[PDB]
């Protein structure tokens with residue numbers, strides 16, 4: 033991913049304000065609610081029967097933390113997303129066989145969650161920079177399909 | 179793309195029966211009929227207003243011949259599709275901005291045309307081998323997006 | 325969304341399918357499992373071998389469901405409500421898989437009915453299967 | 466296919482747009498043109514600059530079309546037939562672009578309507594925009 037220094041600064045600044053404990057869970061949760069077939073990959077996570085159950089599910093919140101950490105790892109090394117995500121790509125593609133469109137969906141759900149949290153501060157230029165990041169992350173996750 | 183020896187033999191045997199003057203135009207023509215937004219990329223080709231107009235359009239047939247030629251070349255370079263298709267990828271992605279889902283559609287329309295022409299010869303194992311090939315070609319064409 | 329002419333094409337083409345509906349459904353499933361092996365994960369306990377009586381049995385179910393959908397092409401959500409609950413609520417089938425099966429059905433039809441599989445009929449059938457797919461991947465209870 | 470709950474959620478959430486229709490529609494377009502620059506290709510002679518009056522005016526049209534869709538949510542193909550002919554027959558917009566604009570509409574609503582944009586309403590709005598997109602990208606005359 034090629035971000036301008038201005039775009040990188042904008043992305044980094046906002047991410048510094050993202051709640052490490054909650055935003056990943058909010059994004060993973062909304063993925064499971066908005067695109068219900070994704071629940072099939074999370075049988076062992078217990079109760080996903082209603083939106084409230086999903087968003088309050090402790091395992092969803094916990095797993096979400098990991099997901100966010102991976103986006104954070106991506107932000108730390110935008111010039112090597114492929115290398116950063118190589119193990120995760122093997123897992124999601126070769127082991128789990130997640131269709132790669134779902135990677136795009138989760139990235140876009142994260143963008144919605146950032147807009148929800150930050151309101152007017154999530155300007156169109158800030159979004160455009162985040163769209164480059166989440167497309168890069170989705171592509172890196174899908175690398176074993178390519 | 180790796181084919182078993184059995185798959186390679188079966189793919190080559192079927193392709194030898196393909197009418198190289200017609201099948202590409204049939205595939206391209208059916209793409210324009212079945213997925214009509216793809217016509218936007220071929221505004222200069224003249225009459226595309228009816229299925230009969232599309233299928234009998236001389237520019238569709240001629241262009242189709244080129245497309246088929248690219249698939250034929252790919253069959254001889256299955257271990258180096260990203261290299262072979264580099265120039266075509268730059269054209270379709272960087273210059274024309276064709277969304278890559280359309281590469282997948284054309285590949286599958288070609289498969290439908292092979293089924294149409296060869297019926298009982300286009301067995302499920304033969305189809306499976308061809309799906310590997312057209313997936314490989316679509317992926318190589320989309321490389322600039324990855 | 326199907327045009328009036330689309331609906332006519334679909335009814336005419338599926339009519340020609342007739343008594344072979346079941347055989348074609350089984351073949352489409354076989355094509356899907358072989359061409360797109362990830363789809364087999366939805367049938368983990370199935371005998372998926374070539375000639376499987378279980379796959380043949382399932383193919384007939386799928387074909388009969390399509391015949392029902394063709395019969396209710398103006399009212400597909402109501403006609404397919406049980407099947408939608410099964411595929412979208414219970415099985416949670418990823419929508420990509422419907423594109424794969426739809427393709428394999430078109431391939432099967434093209435192989436068996438080449439005269440009938442004109443560009444216009446191809447287009448109408450693709451739209452019909454997409455419409456069926458959208459209903460089966462929707463939760464609308 | 467929308468559930469009764471989906472229709473309830475959409476009517477309620479979109480109902481809060483009101484006189485901000487032009488503003489929100491324009492913001493969603495600006496987000497799309499900036500985030501996904503290939504979409505600009507459909508507007509070759511537009512002023513697409515930040516704060517453009519032309520985009521502001523177009524935003525109102527899109528938003529008003531969505532209002533129309535809500536008021537006819539059980540019978541959308543007949544209500545949006547003119548827009549389908551425009552986008553599918555005349556402009557031949559690639560379906561991917563509707564996913565891009567739909568996403569940018571959701572982002573816009575999330576940024577302006579935090580109380581309304583619950584996970585359930587988010588899900589319903591996504592389905593609604595997908596249904597509208599399918600109508601606008603279909604040829605069914």
Ligand code: HEM
Pocket residue numbers: 070073074076098099102103120124128130134135136138139169170173
């Ligand atoms: C697109 C961005 C995504 C990122 C950054 C991401 C990141 C991660 C991470 C960090 C893990 C934990 C890996 C480990 O502990 O070894 C994980 C596991 C997993 N992911 Fe994702 N993921 C993404 C998309 C998805 C999607 C879309 C799905 C399914 C629809 C999915 C399904 C799973 C599953 C099933 C696991 C294993 C859960 C378990 O331990 O039971 N992932 N992912």
Ligand code: HEM
Pocket residue numbers: 216217219220222244245246248249266269270274276280281282284285315316319
């Ligand atoms: C997926 C397999 C595809 C293959 C193998 C293929 C192959 C080719 C080839 C060989 C050319 C000629 C290049 C040249 O003259 O330098 C070409 C041109 C072109 N392709 Fe494709 N293509 C594919 C998919 C598509 C799709 C899906 C579209 C969507 C509309 C598309 C749009 C075009 C256009 C607009 C041109 C230039 C036509 C002109 O000269 O005006 N291609 N393609």
Ligand code: HEM
Pocket residue numbers: 363366367385386387389390407410411415417421422423425426456457460
């Ligand atoms: C045109 C599209 C489809 C149609 C018409 C269709 C129709 C059917 C029918 C009629 C049944 C039997 C229901 C019953 O008797 O209880 C069924 C079951 C099932 N379908 Fe589909 N289906 C379609 C697409 C798919 C796809 C794409 C998948 C996954 C790749 C899938 C996975 C399943 C599974 C796992 C079952 C249950 C099998 C079992 O364990 O008994 N379906 N479907």
Ligand code: HEM
Pocket residue numbers: 504507508526527528530531548551552556558562563564566567594597598601
């Ligand atoms: C929810 C999705 C959409 C809605 C509700 C919508 C609605 C509208 C409306 C109401 C108009 C004006 C119609 C008139 O003047 O009579 C219009 C025009 C137009 N739309 Fe959309 N649209 C949508 C998606 C898109 C997308 C995704 C694109 C392309 C990326 C697009 C490209 C255009 C173009 C090029 C025009 C004509 C502009 C001109 O030259 O005057 N639309 N649309």
